[PDB]
Amino acid sequence: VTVTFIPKLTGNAFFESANKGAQKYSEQWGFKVDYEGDANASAASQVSVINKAVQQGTNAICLSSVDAAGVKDALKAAADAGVTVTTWDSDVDPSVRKVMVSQGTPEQLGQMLVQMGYDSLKERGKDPEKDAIKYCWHYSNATVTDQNSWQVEGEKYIKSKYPNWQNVAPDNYYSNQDAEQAISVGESILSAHSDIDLIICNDSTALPGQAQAAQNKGLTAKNVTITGFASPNSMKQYCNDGILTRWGLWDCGIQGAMGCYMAYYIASGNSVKVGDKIEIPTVGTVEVMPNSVLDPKADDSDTSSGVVLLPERTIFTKDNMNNYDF
Ligand SMILES: C[C@@]1(O)OC[C@H](O)C1(O)O
Give the CATH number, domain containing residue 285.
3.40.50.2300
CB 185, CB 226: distance < 8 Å: no
The single-letter DSSP state of residue 229 is B
Question: Do residues 71 and 151 both lie within one domain?
Answer: no
Per the structure, how many domains does the chain have? Answer: 2
- Ligand 1 binding residues, C-beta < 6 A: 8, 14, 64, 89-90, 146-147, 202-204, 229
Which residue's alpha carbon is nearest to atom 8 within ligand 1? 203
Q: What are phi and psi of 110, to 5 degrees?
A: -60, -45
Ligand 1: centre distance to CA 57 (Å): 29
Question: In angstroms, rounded to a whole number, what is the distance separating the alpha carbons of residues 1 and 273?
Answer: 21
Best of 5, 90, 175 for a ligand 1 pocket test (most atoms within 8 Å of beta carbon)? 90
Question: In angstroms, rounded to a whole number, what is the distance separating the alpha carbons of residues 19 and 6?
Answer: 9
Question: Do residues 128 and 141 both lie within one domain?
Answer: yes
Question: In angstroms, rounded to a whole number, what is the distance separating the alpha carbons of residues 66 and 95?
Answer: 17
Beta-carbon contacts of 225 under 8 Å, excluding residues fewer than 6 positions away, are: 117, 120, 121, 124, 126, 197, 198, 199, 244, 245
Question: In angstroms, rounded to a whole number, what is the distance separating the alpha carbons of residues 295 and 91?
Answer: 11
Residue 159, SS3 per DSSP: helix
Nearest to 174 by CA among 153, 192, 189: 189
Question: Do residues 224 and 123 both lie within one domain?
Answer: yes
Ligand 1: centre distance to CA 130 (Å): 30
Best of 203, 233, 313, 326 for a ligand 1 pocket test (most atoms within 8 Å of beta carbon)? 203
Question: Do residues 146 and 14 both lie within one domain?
Answer: no
Q: Which residue(s) pair with 314 in the sheet?
A: 249
Question: Do residues 159 and 215 both lie within one domain?
Answer: yes
Best of 202, 207, 313 for a ligand 1 pocket test (most atoms within 8 Å of beta carbon)? 202
Question: Do residues 196 and 133 both lie within one domain?
Answer: yes
Ligand 1: centre distance to CA 117 (Å): 17
Q: What are phi and psi of 292, to 5 degrees?
A: -70, -5
DSSP string across 47-107: HHHHHHHHHTT-SEEEE--S-SGGGHHHHHHHHHTT-EEEEESS---GGG-SEEEES--HH
Q: Residue 228 CA: which ligand 1 atom is closest?
A: 3
Ligand 1: centre distance to CA 204 (Å): 5
Ligand 1: centre distance to CA 269 (Å): 31
Question: In angstroms, rounded to a whole number, what is the distance separating the alpha carbons of residues 69 and 91?
Answer: 10
Question: Do residues 225 and 321 both lie within one domain?
Answer: yes
Nearest to 308 by CA among 37, 283, 188, 3: 283
Ligand 1: centre distance to CA 232 (Å): 13
Give the experimental resolution in Å. Answer: 1.4
**Radius of gyration (C-alpha) of the chain in whole angstroms:** 19
Q: Residue 206 CA: which ligand 1 atom is closest?
A: 4
Ligand 1: centre distance to CA 151 (Å): 13
Q: What are phi and psi of 255, to 5 degrees?
A: -65, -50
Question: Do residues 231 and 205 both lie within one domain?
Answer: yes
Q: What are phi and psi of 90, to 5 degrees?
A: -130, 120
Q: Which domain holds residue 169?
A: 103-250+311-326
Question: In angstroms, rounded to a whole number, what is the distance separating the alpha carbons of residues 49 and 55?
Answer: 10
Beta-carbon contacts of 215 under 8 Å, excluding residues fewer than 6 positions away, are: 238, 241, 243
Question: Do residues 172 and 213 both lie within one domain?
Answer: yes
Instruction: List, in sequence order, every beta strand (DSSP E) within the chain.
Output: 2-6, 32-35, 60-63, 84-88, 99-102, 134-139, 166-167, 173-174, 198-201, 225-228, 247-249, 277-280, 284-287, 306-309, 314-316
Ligand 1: centre distance to CA 228 (Å): 10
Question: In angstroms, rounded to a whole number, what is the distance separating the alpha carbons of residues 183 and 178?
Answer: 9
Question: Do residues 193 and 326 both lie within one domain?
Answer: yes
Question: Do residues 114 and 220 both lie within one domain?
Answer: yes
In one-letter notation, the amino acid at residue 291 is N
Give helix 72-80 / helix 43-55 axis angle, nearest 10°: 10
Question: In angstroms, rounded to a whole number, what is the distance separating the alpha carbons of residues 88 and 172?
Answer: 24
**Strand 134-139, strand 198-201: pairing:** parallel
CB 150, CB 185: distance < 8 Å: no
Q: Residue 205 CA: which ligand 1 atom is closest?
A: 4
Element holding 185 (H helix, E strand): helix 179-192
User: For the chain, how many residues are written?
Assistant: 326
Residue 273 gets the label, from left (phi > 0), alpha (psi -120 to 50) or beta, of beta
Question: Do residues 22 and 141 both lie within one domain?
Answer: no
